A = this chain, B = another copy of it.
């Protein structure tokens, strides 16, 4: 099995392609753990450790910068609305060069509880994320924030 990184989010459920070597599988699981540790903590030093310099978001939210600068922007922004935001990995699916993560995000926005999920697909090369497709339940989040319905 893969030895998970301590002090970073541990997947609640996981499926790993067994044709991957121990080194390969570890580095893919490790990349995802760093990515979600970044979303859980906002520690910007994790960015160059986790994604490549040419990181590309195929599902770029409106007004988020493309690339690594967009990751900084997004994490700070999420912390503006939800200062105590927390990210957990519900399920992690690792195959070939791809990783699917299903995430749960929780916290408080002033006097309102926040609770929404997300699903991401990561392309991982040599232990770093080169590109992603991701989606958060933005309608649920906007309602919870008091912005909609």
Query: Which A residues form the contact surface with B (CB < 8 A)?
Result: 15-19, 59, 91, 93-98, 100, 102, 117-121, 133-139, 142, 148
Contacts and interface: CB of A to CB of B under 8 A. Distances in A.
A135 B137 contact: yes
Given A17-B19, A139-B139, A98 B102 contact: no
Contacts of A121: 91, 93, 100, 102, 119
A72 B142 CA distance: 28
A121 B102 CA distance: 9
B95 A17 contact: yes
A98 B15 contact: yes
A93 B100 contact: yes
Tell me the interface secondary structure of chain A in the complex: strand
Nearest to A134: B119
Contacts of A59: 117, 137
Contacts of A135: 117-119, 135-137
Given A93-B93, A137-B138, 18 more contacts: A15-B97, A15-B98, A16-B95, A17-B18, A17-B19, A59-B137, A91-B98, A91-B133, A93-B100, A93-B121, A98-B100, A100-B119, A117-B133, A119-B120, A119-B121, A135-B137, A139-B139, A139-B142
A48 B35 CA distance: 39
